[PDB]
Amino acid sequence: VNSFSGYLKLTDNVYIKNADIVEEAKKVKPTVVVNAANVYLKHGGGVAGALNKATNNAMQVESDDYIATNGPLKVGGSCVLSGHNLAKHCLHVVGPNVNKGEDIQLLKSAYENFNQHEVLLAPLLSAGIFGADPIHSLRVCVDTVRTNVYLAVFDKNLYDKLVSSFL
């Protein structure tokens, strides 16, 4: 039993809700929140910009130190950093940016990072400002993640559509 509330159950291990991941994190304070990061951990917009803003820029300060030490992530890769005031941890995951010409096959690799954590609050990866189709992203998530994932979908029309169109 966990403290996620009001989620629609999609599969054995995948749950979904029309919600802002930032608001879900502030209320639930989960163990792991997933950030839809880029390779530079430059949290400028979308999920990352909103999460970072909610941490009063502490996420960005921590991230800049991480990059200065370790260099950029790989597309499809991840790192675990603090969750600040939003969660115990933040799993920064880089999905492919198809506007950058990045291989959409890397979306499966990105979701594989979720399997290292028993329970996660997450957004759909590679969609939105990253350019990919959120319908496809949900399919890859369901077919890749085996741990318990609670997906927060920001846009109602999209949520209603992913649910109505989910097989």
Ligand X SMILES: OC[C@@H]1CC2(CC2)CN1c1ncnc2[nH]ccc12
Binding site for ligand X (CB under 6 A): 20-22, 36, 46-47, 50, 123-124, 127-129, 152, 154
Nearer to ligand X, 71 or 136 (CB): 136
Measured distance CA(41)–CA(105) in Å, rounded: 21
Cβ 110 vs Cβ 76: under 8 Å: yes
Handedness of CA 32, 75, 13, 53 (dihedral sign): positive
Cα angle 91, 164, 140; round to 5: 35
Nearer to ligand X, 76 or 123 (CB): 123
Cα angle 88, 22, 103; round to 5: 90
Nearer to ligand X, 65 or 143 (CB): 143
The least distance separating ligand X from the CB of residue 70, rounded to whole angstroms, comes to 25
Q: Which residue is nearest to ligand X (CB)?
A: 128
Nearer to ligand X, 97 or 109 (CB): 97
